[model samples]
Target: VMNRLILAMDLMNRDDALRVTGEVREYIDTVKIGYPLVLSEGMDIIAEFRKRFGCRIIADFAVADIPETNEKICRATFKAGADAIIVHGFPGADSVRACLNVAEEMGREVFLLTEMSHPGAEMFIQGAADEIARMGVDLGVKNYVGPSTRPERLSRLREIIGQDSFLISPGVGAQGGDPGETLRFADAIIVGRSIYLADNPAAAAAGIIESIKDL
Candidate 1:
């Protein structure tokens, strides 16, 4: 388990992301670096974050591309110092397998995004989410990404992946996901806007941790 708390550092600016992340550093040792921050800055930001915080960086790329393209993306991300990368299952097994191959060579990890947290996910991803999770297992993937917003769906994913697979869920707080209940099934829960956009990020993260500490 990765502290049962991973910060979704989705802020776009370098200074803002770094500042807020450091403010809540004590409560979060694992952070999810997504397009917002990486696109705003660069892959170098991944190294910068590691140097500054000594934290585990999970690149939330949600990579969905062809096998050839997915391979290159994984190469660049691994070379850039991401401890792990997330690839979407919707792209089919070949694409996901490409990432896994690269990760195996780089000695990193790949988290398959089975279901997204937003409403739009219900439109397409929801229907395929179960099969996607099944395919991940069929491909020998050990990590997964699930939605925190729906505990039922989250628990179902857990059952499919079994207790052995590592799972991290996003959508807590601002997205209306409950951390305590989310943790009942997930190894860790990812929180973003609620903490990053808070008046006091440290307190925001602290309150979240405190709420689930006894659980």
Candidate 2:
């Protein structure tokens, strides 16, 4: 139940990410390290965040590489202390399979990105989201990254993926997603700017976390 709220550690620097995590760790279940942050600070950020807060870290790198390199990329991501990694679902079945293979071997979780929170996502993710979801399911992938901003798509994915699979939604806070509405269908909600950018990040996170308790 506590795993429902995921804090998106999208800050540019190491100290700011750590500072927010330290303050809000008690309320959230996991911390998601966005690509920008990971690229800026490197994998050491994962190790440091884990050591400091002891929270689960989801590396949101959104991998989109050739089939031959997917395994190696997943290996590096997990080696960096990411409990789970998000992969781009558009890379075709074989590539998705490669990532899943590594995740299974490494005992890590893989969350395939189906839809996104940003507006530009509709151009790509929406059109093929169902197909992508089907591909991930076919490859035995259990976790997925979907959009909270579009609940209709979320509902459709939920139907396609079924109840057993876990769906993680982002776009809350800064992206204009309503946690109360999104949590109704999402297994976990990934929130970023709403908490991190607030004058009182801890309080902001607590408010969001509390809001989802009934849903």
Candidate 3:
């Protein structure tokens, strides 16, 4: 039962990214760094966050490619100091397995991203999201990424995967996902814009974390 808050540090610039993250450092258990920071500041930023905050990092590259390309990406990502990498299961089991293979070799973890938290996900991704979650289970995946924007679907996903696998949700703050409500199904909630873009990042994060204390 993680019941933790994960900072989705999607802010791009190095200075702002590090500054905002440091502001809310006390409330975050892990920082989910994606292409936003990795592209703006470079892969070295992962180690920088680990050194400064002493927090776990998840590289949200959304790995989607052929097996060969996926393998190289995961290798370099973990080499850069990510504790885990998020891979898109929509690319099929072969691509997901490629990431899993690298994770095993490197003694890291792979999180199968089953669905997106944004409303746009409903158009197409939601249609196949269940199948993707099932595939992850069949492939022996132990971690998953679900949506907070839709709790009913999120609960169905939990039912599909059972209790052993860990699930993290995005869309908490800026995306209108309730912190405590989302926790009913997810192990942790991922918040990005709401906290990072707030006038006071620390207060924003602390408030959100406080709301979930009942968990």
Candidate 4:
């Protein structure tokens, strides 16, 4: 599970994010730069992560907007040094499809946000989860972000998206998600507060890494 673990550095401070990522660099696969960090540090954070740890970076932009604007936003995301991006499906098919167009041309990845782990997500995501997953498949998106806490919902999504595609699960420990169970359907896992908030960040990451195996 070495390359399957993605550390979500959802921080507002540059040094704090760097410290957590640097500590778990050898144990994890990818680094996720969330909105707070990106907005605070800009694209230079991507360059710093690359220079210091040399890991894959996912810009969790959580983009939600019109299709025309989404295309340009996605292009800027890639130019900012993101290896992949996280886009919200709430905006509908045209929006998601536009991002996919840019990702395909840039040879970058786009992780479609289906059902989220947070409870408030049901207000919007749950009802259209199936439709969003289907839309992603129709648009040729190969990566997805589903809830790690709701394994049943994730299972149904896997069926709709099919086995050829990859699913990235976040909201682990802190949000009450079990990697052991979620990793069964997920190709990769994104762990945040669990590791970063622990007393010992490296040990927290190592423990999670040791608990899961290649599926």
TM-score of each candidate structure, all chains considered together: 0.98, 0.96, 0.97, 0.95
Residue-wise C-alpha lDDT for candidate 2, range 108-176, written one tens digit per residue = 999999988789988877898899999888888899888999988898989889899999999987888
| Model 1 Cα shift for residue 169 (angstroms) | 0.4
Best by lDDT: 1
Which candidate, 3 or 4, has the higher lDDT? 3
Per-residue lDDT of 105-140 in model 1, one digit per residue for the tens?
999999999999999999999999999999999999
Per-residue accuracy of model 3 over 102-188 as CA lDDT, tens digit each: 999999999999989988898988999999999999999999999999999899999989999999999887788888888999989
The lowest-lDDT stretch of 10 consecutive residues in candidate 3 is: 1-10
Better of 1 and 4 by lDDT: 1
Least accurate stretch of 10 residues (summed lDDT) in model 2? 1-10
Give a tens-digit lDDT track for model 4, residues 1-215: 35588998987898888888888888976888888888888877887886788888898988899999999989988887789989998788889989989998998989999888899988978999999888888888888999998999989989999999989999889999998888888888899899988889999988887888543
- lDDT comparing candidate 4 with the true structure: 0.87
- The RMSD (Cα, Å) of candidate 3 is 1.2
Winning model by TM-score: 1
Ranking by TM-score: 1, 3, 2, 4
Cα RMSDs of all predictions?
A: 0.8, 1.2, 1.2, 1.4
